[PDB]
Amino acid sequence: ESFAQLFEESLKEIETRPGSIVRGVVVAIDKDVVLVDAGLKSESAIPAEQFKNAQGELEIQVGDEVDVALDAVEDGFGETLLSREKAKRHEAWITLEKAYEDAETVTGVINGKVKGGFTVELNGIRAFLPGSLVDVRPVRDTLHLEGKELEFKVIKLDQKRNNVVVSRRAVIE
Protein backbone atom coordinates (compact mmCIF):
# COMPACT_ATOMS: atom_id res chain seq x y z
CA GLU A 1 0.00 0.00 0.00
CA SER A 2 1.80 3.00 1.38
CA PHE A 3 3.53 0.02 2.95
CA ALA A 4 5.54 -0.01 -0.28
CA GLN A 5 6.08 3.75 -0.33
CA LEU A 6 7.25 3.76 3.27
CA PHE A 7 9.31 0.60 2.43
CA GLU A 8 10.91 2.55 -0.41
CA GLU A 9 11.91 5.51 1.73
CA SER A 10 13.01 3.01 4.36
CA LEU A 11 15.29 1.30 1.89
CA LYS A 12 16.54 4.71 0.82
CA GLU A 13 17.30 5.37 4.48
CA ILE A 14 19.17 2.08 4.88
CA GLU A 15 21.60 2.51 1.99
CA THR A 16 23.93 5.26 0.73
CA ARG A 17 25.77 5.87 -2.53
CA PRO A 18 29.57 5.32 -1.82
CA GLY A 19 31.31 2.23 -0.67
CA SER A 20 30.31 2.81 2.91
CA ILE A 21 27.83 0.20 4.11
CA VAL A 22 29.41 -3.25 4.13
CA ARG A 23 26.47 -5.04 2.63
CA GLY A 24 27.30 -7.20 -0.37
CA VAL A 25 27.50 -10.85 0.61
CA VAL A 26 29.84 -12.83 -1.59
CA VAL A 27 27.40 -15.20 -3.21
CA ALA A 28 29.59 -16.88 -5.85
CA ILE A 29 33.36 -17.25 -6.08
CA ASP A 30 35.14 -18.48 -9.22
CA LYS A 31 38.62 -17.60 -10.34
CA ASP A 32 38.90 -15.04 -11.53
CA VAL A 33 35.59 -13.34 -10.60
CA VAL A 34 34.07 -12.55 -7.21
CA LEU A 35 30.46 -11.33 -7.03
CA VAL A 36 28.35 -9.67 -4.33
CA ASP A 37 24.89 -8.16 -3.87
CA ALA A 38 24.71 -4.97 -1.83
CA GLY A 39 21.04 -4.30 -2.46
CA LEU A 40 21.67 -2.91 -5.99
CA LYS A 41 19.82 -3.58 -9.35
CA SER A 42 22.49 -6.23 -10.36
CA GLU A 43 25.53 -8.23 -9.00
CA SER A 44 29.13 -6.88 -9.37
CA ALA A 45 31.67 -8.55 -11.57
CA ILE A 46 34.43 -8.19 -9.00
CA PRO A 47 38.04 -8.92 -9.88
CA ALA A 48 39.92 -11.30 -7.63
CA GLU A 49 42.59 -8.65 -7.27
CA GLN A 50 40.59 -6.25 -5.16
CA PHE A 51 40.43 -9.22 -2.74
CA LYS A 52 43.71 -10.89 -1.98
CA ASN A 53 45.72 -9.49 0.88
CA ALA A 54 49.42 -8.68 0.76
CA GLN A 55 50.76 -12.07 -0.38
CA GLY A 56 48.47 -13.11 -3.20
CA GLU A 57 45.84 -15.52 -1.92
CA LEU A 58 42.14 -14.94 -1.26
CA GLU A 59 40.75 -14.13 2.19
CA ILE A 60 36.94 -14.17 1.96
CA GLN A 61 34.59 -17.12 1.33
CA VAL A 62 30.82 -17.17 0.85
CA GLY A 63 28.70 -14.84 2.98
CA ASP A 64 31.48 -12.33 3.61
CA GLU A 65 30.72 -8.63 3.46
CA VAL A 66 32.69 -5.71 2.00
CA ASP A 67 31.18 -2.52 0.61
CA VAL A 68 32.14 -1.59 -2.91
CA ALA A 69 31.33 1.86 -4.37
CA LEU A 70 28.75 3.73 -6.43
CA ASP A 71 27.51 6.89 -8.25
CA ALA A 72 28.01 5.25 -11.65
CA VAL A 73 24.99 3.40 -13.00
CA GLU A 74 24.61 0.96 -15.93
CA ASP A 75 27.30 0.63 -18.62
CA GLY A 76 24.99 -1.80 -20.46
CA PHE A 77 24.45 -4.41 -17.76
CA GLY A 78 25.93 -4.60 -14.26
CA GLU A 79 26.62 -2.62 -11.09
CA THR A 80 29.53 -1.10 -9.35
CA LEU A 81 32.86 0.51 -9.02
CA LEU A 82 35.23 -1.63 -6.94
CA SER A 83 35.20 -2.13 -3.16
CA ARG A 84 39.01 -1.81 -2.92
CA GLU A 85 38.70 1.97 -3.27
CA LYS A 86 36.19 1.49 -0.34
CA ALA A 87 39.30 0.70 1.76
CA LYS A 88 40.86 4.01 0.72
CA ARG A 89 38.19 5.81 2.74
CA HIS A 90 39.08 3.64 5.74
CA GLU A 91 42.75 4.54 5.22
CA ALA A 92 41.74 8.20 4.99
CA TRP A 93 39.84 7.84 8.25
CA ILE A 94 42.90 6.39 9.99
CA THR A 95 45.09 9.17 8.57
CA LEU A 96 42.49 11.71 9.72
CA GLU A 97 42.45 10.08 13.22
CA LYS A 98 46.00 11.60 13.66
CA ALA A 99 44.42 15.15 13.87
CA TYR A 100 42.50 14.23 17.13
CA GLU A 101 45.71 13.40 19.17
CA ASP A 102 48.21 14.98 16.62
CA ALA A 103 49.86 11.49 16.08
CA GLU A 104 48.60 8.52 13.91
CA THR A 105 50.73 5.44 14.84
CA VAL A 106 50.82 2.18 12.82
CA THR A 107 54.06 0.94 11.25
CA GLY A 108 55.68 2.82 8.36
CA VAL A 109 58.64 1.28 6.54
CA ILE A 110 60.23 3.52 3.90
CA ASN A 111 63.26 2.35 1.95
CA GLY A 112 63.42 4.92 -0.89
CA LYS A 113 62.15 7.98 -2.74
CA VAL A 114 60.77 7.53 -6.25
CA LYS A 115 60.16 11.29 -6.27
CA GLY A 116 62.05 12.84 -3.33
CA GLY A 117 60.07 11.33 -0.43
CA PHE A 118 60.54 7.79 0.88
CA THR A 119 57.68 5.40 0.01
CA VAL A 120 55.54 4.31 2.91
CA GLU A 121 53.23 1.33 2.74
CA LEU A 122 50.38 0.78 5.23
CA ASN A 123 48.86 -2.72 5.34
CA GLY A 124 48.17 -3.80 1.75
CA ILE A 125 48.63 -0.38 0.12
CA ARG A 126 51.89 1.51 -0.37
CA ALA A 127 51.98 5.25 -0.57
CA PHE A 128 54.52 7.84 -1.79
CA LEU A 129 55.44 10.86 0.30
CA PRO A 130 57.64 13.95 -0.23
CA GLY A 131 61.29 13.56 0.58
CA SER A 132 61.40 15.16 4.03
CA LEU A 133 58.58 13.04 5.46
CA VAL A 134 60.56 9.79 5.61
CA ASP A 135 63.05 11.04 8.22
CA VAL A 136 62.53 13.38 11.17
CA ARG A 137 65.98 14.89 10.71
CA PRO A 138 68.80 14.12 8.28
CA VAL A 139 69.09 10.52 9.50
CA ARG A 140 68.29 8.82 6.18
CA ASP A 141 67.04 5.17 6.19
CA THR A 142 69.68 4.08 3.61
CA LEU A 143 71.96 3.11 6.55
CA HIS A 144 69.03 1.52 8.39
CA LEU A 145 68.37 -2.20 7.93
CA GLU A 146 66.51 -2.50 4.66
CA GLY A 147 62.74 -2.07 4.74
CA LYS A 148 62.90 -1.32 8.48
CA GLU A 149 60.13 -1.23 11.09
CA LEU A 150 59.10 2.08 12.70
CA GLU A 151 55.56 3.50 12.10
CA PHE A 152 55.01 6.68 10.01
CA LYS A 153 54.92 10.18 11.68
CA VAL A 154 53.36 12.47 9.14
CA ILE A 155 55.63 15.11 7.51
CA LYS A 156 53.53 16.34 4.61
CA LEU A 157 50.32 15.59 2.78
CA ASP A 158 48.95 17.39 -0.31
CA GLN A 159 45.24 17.18 0.77
CA LYS A 160 43.67 17.07 -2.77
CA ARG A 161 46.04 15.02 -4.85
CA ASN A 162 46.88 12.10 -2.52
CA ASN A 163 50.59 12.11 -1.67
CA VAL A 164 51.51 11.51 1.99
CA VAL A 165 55.14 11.57 3.24
CA VAL A 166 55.53 9.84 6.67
CA SER A 167 58.38 9.86 9.57
CA ARG A 168 60.34 6.61 10.02
CA ARG A 169 62.29 5.78 13.21
CA ALA A 170 62.93 8.32 15.94
CA VAL A 171 60.13 7.21 18.31
CA ILE A 172 61.10 9.92 20.81
CA GLU A 173 60.26 12.74 18.41
Binding site: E1, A4, F7, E8, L11, K12, R17, V27, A28, D37, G39, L40, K41, S42, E43, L70, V73, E74, F77
Partner: protein, 225 residues
Amino acid sequence: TVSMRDMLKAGVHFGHQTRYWNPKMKPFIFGARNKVHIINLEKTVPMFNEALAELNKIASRKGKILFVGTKRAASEAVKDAALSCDQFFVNHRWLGGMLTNWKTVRQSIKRLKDLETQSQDGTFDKLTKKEALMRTRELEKLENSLGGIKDMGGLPDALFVIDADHEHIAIKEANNLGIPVFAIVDTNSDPDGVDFVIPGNDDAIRAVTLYLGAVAATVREGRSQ
Protein backbone atom coordinates in the same frame (compact mmCIF):
# COMPACT_ATOMS: atom_id res chain seq x y z
CA THR B 1 1.73 -17.66 -3.33
CA VAL B 2 5.09 -15.85 -3.53
CA SER B 3 5.25 -13.03 -0.97
CA MET B 4 6.33 -9.42 -1.52
CA ARG B 5 8.97 -9.40 1.22
CA ASP B 6 10.72 -12.39 -0.33
CA MET B 7 10.69 -10.69 -3.73
CA LEU B 8 12.18 -7.55 -2.20
CA LYS B 9 14.91 -9.60 -0.54
CA ALA B 10 15.70 -11.28 -3.85
CA GLY B 11 15.97 -7.95 -5.72
CA VAL B 12 12.90 -8.07 -8.00
CA HIS B 13 12.05 -4.41 -7.32
CA PHE B 14 15.37 -3.28 -8.90
CA GLY B 15 15.34 -2.53 -12.65
CA HIS B 16 17.66 -1.10 -15.30
CA GLN B 17 19.09 2.42 -15.61
CA THR B 18 16.66 5.18 -16.63
CA ARG B 19 18.24 5.83 -20.05
CA TYR B 20 17.77 2.17 -21.13
CA TRP B 21 14.04 1.98 -20.24
CA ASN B 22 11.04 1.26 -22.45
CA PRO B 23 8.12 3.71 -22.05
CA LYS B 24 5.67 0.78 -22.50
CA MET B 25 6.91 -0.33 -19.03
CA LYS B 26 5.82 3.02 -17.48
CA PRO B 27 2.72 1.43 -15.88
CA PHE B 28 4.80 -1.25 -14.11
CA ILE B 29 7.44 1.26 -12.90
CA PHE B 30 7.07 2.86 -9.45
CA GLY B 31 9.94 5.39 -9.31
CA ALA B 32 13.65 6.02 -9.91
CA ARG B 33 16.14 5.70 -7.03
CA ASN B 34 19.76 6.77 -7.74
CA LYS B 35 19.02 7.07 -11.50
CA VAL B 36 17.88 3.40 -11.69
CA HIS B 37 14.26 2.34 -12.31
CA ILE B 38 12.27 0.65 -9.53
CA ILE B 39 9.54 -1.82 -10.52
CA ASN B 40 6.22 -1.49 -8.67
CA LEU B 41 5.85 -4.64 -6.53
CA GLU B 42 2.19 -3.76 -5.76
CA LYS B 43 1.35 -4.15 -9.48
CA THR B 44 3.83 -6.99 -10.09
CA VAL B 45 2.74 -9.51 -7.47
CA PRO B 46 -0.90 -10.02 -8.48
CA MET B 47 0.14 -10.38 -12.12
CA PHE B 48 2.78 -12.91 -11.13
CA ASN B 49 0.21 -14.86 -9.12
CA GLU B 50 -2.16 -14.86 -12.09
CA ALA B 51 0.61 -16.14 -14.35
CA LEU B 52 1.41 -18.91 -11.88
CA ALA B 53 -2.26 -19.90 -11.75
CA GLU B 54 -2.40 -20.01 -15.54
CA LEU B 55 0.70 -22.21 -15.63
CA ASN B 56 -0.84 -24.56 -13.08
CA LYS B 57 -4.02 -24.77 -15.15
CA ILE B 58 -1.98 -25.57 -18.25
CA ALA B 59 -0.12 -28.30 -16.37
CA SER B 60 -3.41 -29.78 -15.19
CA ARG B 61 -4.54 -30.47 -18.78
CA LYS B 62 -1.11 -32.16 -19.46
CA GLY B 63 0.44 -29.06 -21.04
CA LYS B 64 4.04 -28.99 -22.27
CA ILE B 65 6.00 -26.05 -20.81
CA LEU B 66 9.22 -24.67 -22.33
CA PHE B 67 11.70 -22.77 -20.14
CA VAL B 68 13.86 -20.27 -22.05
CA GLY B 69 16.88 -18.46 -20.57
CA THR B 70 20.07 -17.90 -22.59
CA LYS B 71 21.65 -15.19 -20.38
CA ARG B 72 24.49 -17.60 -19.35
CA ALA B 73 24.27 -16.42 -15.70
CA ALA B 74 20.95 -18.24 -15.12
CA SER B 75 21.49 -21.05 -17.68
CA GLU B 76 22.38 -23.52 -14.93
CA ALA B 77 19.36 -22.52 -12.87
CA VAL B 78 16.72 -22.65 -15.59
CA LYS B 79 17.77 -26.18 -16.56
CA ASP B 80 17.48 -27.21 -12.92
CA ALA B 81 14.02 -25.67 -12.71
CA ALA B 82 12.96 -27.53 -15.84
CA LEU B 83 14.26 -30.83 -14.52
CA SER B 84 12.61 -30.49 -11.11
CA CYS B 85 9.16 -30.54 -12.74
CA ASP B 86 10.36 -32.83 -15.62
CA GLN B 87 9.67 -30.16 -18.28
CA PHE B 88 11.63 -29.00 -21.35
CA PHE B 89 14.04 -26.07 -21.70
CA VAL B 90 16.39 -24.02 -23.86
CA ASN B 91 19.24 -22.83 -21.60
CA HIS B 92 21.71 -22.13 -24.46
CA ARG B 93 21.15 -19.99 -27.60
CA TRP B 94 17.66 -20.30 -29.05
CA LEU B 95 17.90 -21.73 -32.60
CA GLY B 96 16.17 -19.29 -34.96
CA GLY B 97 12.92 -20.98 -35.90
CA MET B 98 12.95 -23.72 -33.28
CA LEU B 99 9.15 -23.76 -33.05
CA THR B 100 8.07 -22.13 -36.36
CA ASN B 101 10.50 -24.43 -38.16
CA TRP B 102 9.92 -27.47 -35.94
CA LYS B 103 9.79 -30.04 -38.79
CA THR B 104 13.45 -29.35 -39.70
CA VAL B 105 14.52 -29.17 -36.05
CA ARG B 106 12.68 -32.48 -35.41
CA GLN B 107 15.21 -34.06 -37.82
CA SER B 108 18.07 -32.55 -35.83
CA ILE B 109 16.57 -33.88 -32.61
CA LYS B 110 16.25 -37.34 -34.14
CA ARG B 111 19.89 -37.21 -35.24
CA LEU B 112 20.95 -36.21 -31.74
CA LYS B 113 18.96 -39.09 -30.26
CA ASP B 114 20.60 -41.51 -32.68
CA LEU B 115 24.04 -40.19 -31.73
CA GLU B 116 23.22 -40.63 -28.05
CA THR B 117 22.09 -44.20 -28.68
CA GLN B 118 25.31 -44.93 -30.55
CA SER B 119 27.34 -43.52 -27.67
CA GLN B 120 25.53 -45.42 -24.93
CA ASP B 121 23.36 -48.42 -25.81
CA GLY B 122 25.47 -49.80 -28.69
CA THR B 123 28.70 -50.43 -26.73
CA PHE B 124 30.40 -51.19 -30.08
CA ASP B 125 33.42 -48.85 -29.71
CA LYS B 126 36.11 -49.62 -32.39
CA LEU B 127 35.89 -46.37 -34.36
CA THR B 128 38.50 -44.36 -36.30
CA LYS B 129 39.99 -41.86 -33.89
CA LYS B 130 39.38 -38.67 -35.83
CA GLU B 131 35.92 -39.78 -36.92
CA ALA B 132 35.03 -40.77 -33.36
CA LEU B 133 36.22 -37.39 -32.09
CA MET B 134 34.10 -35.62 -34.70
CA ARG B 135 31.07 -37.67 -33.68
CA THR B 136 31.65 -36.79 -30.04
CA ARG B 137 31.90 -33.11 -30.92
CA GLU B 138 28.65 -33.31 -32.87
CA LEU B 139 26.94 -34.98 -29.92
CA GLU B 140 28.20 -32.26 -27.59
CA LYS B 141 26.90 -29.58 -29.95
CA LEU B 142 23.49 -31.22 -30.15
CA GLU B 143 23.22 -31.73 -26.39
CA ASN B 144 24.06 -28.09 -25.71
CA SER B 145 21.47 -26.87 -28.20
CA LEU B 146 18.54 -29.29 -27.96
CA GLY B 147 19.15 -31.26 -24.73
CA GLY B 148 16.05 -30.05 -22.89
CA ILE B 149 13.68 -30.29 -25.88
CA LYS B 150 14.69 -33.78 -27.15
CA ASP B 151 11.69 -35.46 -25.45
CA MET B 152 9.20 -32.66 -26.32
CA GLY B 153 7.82 -34.56 -29.35
CA GLY B 154 5.73 -31.72 -30.81
CA LEU B 155 5.30 -28.04 -29.92
CA PRO B 156 4.86 -26.78 -26.34
CA ASP B 157 1.47 -25.58 -25.06
CA ALA B 158 3.09 -22.69 -23.13
CA LEU B 159 6.39 -20.78 -23.11
CA PHE B 160 8.04 -19.42 -19.93
CA VAL B 161 10.74 -16.77 -20.58
CA ILE B 162 13.36 -15.13 -18.32
CA ASP B 163 13.99 -12.07 -20.56
CA ALA B 164 11.69 -10.71 -23.29
CA ASP B 165 14.21 -8.39 -25.01
CA HIS B 166 16.89 -11.11 -25.04
CA GLU B 167 14.58 -13.93 -26.23
CA HIS B 168 12.46 -11.81 -28.60
CA ILE B 169 12.95 -14.34 -31.40
CA ALA B 170 11.41 -17.05 -29.24
CA ILE B 171 8.58 -14.76 -28.18
CA LYS B 172 7.90 -13.78 -31.79
CA GLU B 173 7.81 -17.45 -32.80
CA ALA B 174 5.35 -18.19 -30.00
CA ASN B 175 3.15 -15.31 -31.13
CA ASN B 176 3.22 -16.59 -34.70
CA LEU B 177 2.24 -20.06 -33.52
CA GLY B 178 -0.28 -18.95 -30.89
CA ILE B 179 1.41 -20.40 -27.80
CA PRO B 180 0.85 -18.55 -24.50
CA VAL B 181 3.96 -16.65 -23.35
CA PHE B 182 4.97 -16.10 -19.70
CA ALA B 183 7.80 -13.59 -19.81
CA ILE B 184 9.77 -11.91 -17.05
CA VAL B 185 9.99 -8.35 -18.36
CA ASP B 186 12.45 -5.77 -16.97
CA THR B 187 12.02 -2.01 -17.61
CA ASN B 188 14.20 -2.06 -20.77
CA SER B 189 12.12 -4.88 -22.35
CA ASP B 190 9.01 -4.76 -24.56
CA PRO B 191 5.83 -6.34 -23.08
CA ASP B 192 3.63 -6.16 -26.25
CA GLY B 193 4.39 -9.66 -27.59
CA VAL B 194 4.01 -11.19 -24.12
CA ASP B 195 0.59 -12.54 -23.05
CA PHE B 196 1.22 -12.88 -19.31
CA VAL B 197 3.81 -10.21 -18.54
CA ILE B 198 5.74 -10.44 -15.24
CA PRO B 199 7.38 -7.09 -14.32
CA GLY B 200 10.67 -8.10 -12.66
CA ASN B 201 14.47 -8.11 -12.62
CA ASP B 202 15.72 -10.45 -15.36
CA ASP B 203 19.41 -9.75 -14.58
CA ALA B 204 19.85 -10.52 -10.85
CA ILE B 205 20.52 -14.22 -10.25
CA ARG B 206 18.65 -14.73 -6.92
CA ALA B 207 15.53 -13.03 -8.38
CA VAL B 208 15.67 -15.23 -11.46
CA THR B 209 15.98 -18.33 -9.29
CA LEU B 210 12.99 -17.23 -7.23
CA TYR B 211 10.96 -16.68 -10.39
CA LEU B 212 11.90 -20.14 -11.64
CA GLY B 213 11.19 -21.95 -8.38
CA ALA B 214 7.60 -20.82 -7.85
CA VAL B 215 6.80 -21.60 -11.47
CA ALA B 216 8.27 -25.08 -11.10
CA ALA B 217 6.24 -25.66 -7.95
CA THR B 218 3.05 -24.57 -9.68
CA VAL B 219 3.77 -26.89 -12.61
CA ARG B 220 4.32 -29.77 -10.20
CA GLU B 221 1.07 -28.96 -8.43
CA GLY B 222 -0.77 -28.93 -11.76
CA ARG B 223 0.72 -32.30 -12.65
CA SER B 224 -0.36 -33.71 -9.30
CA GLN B 225 -3.88 -32.41 -9.85
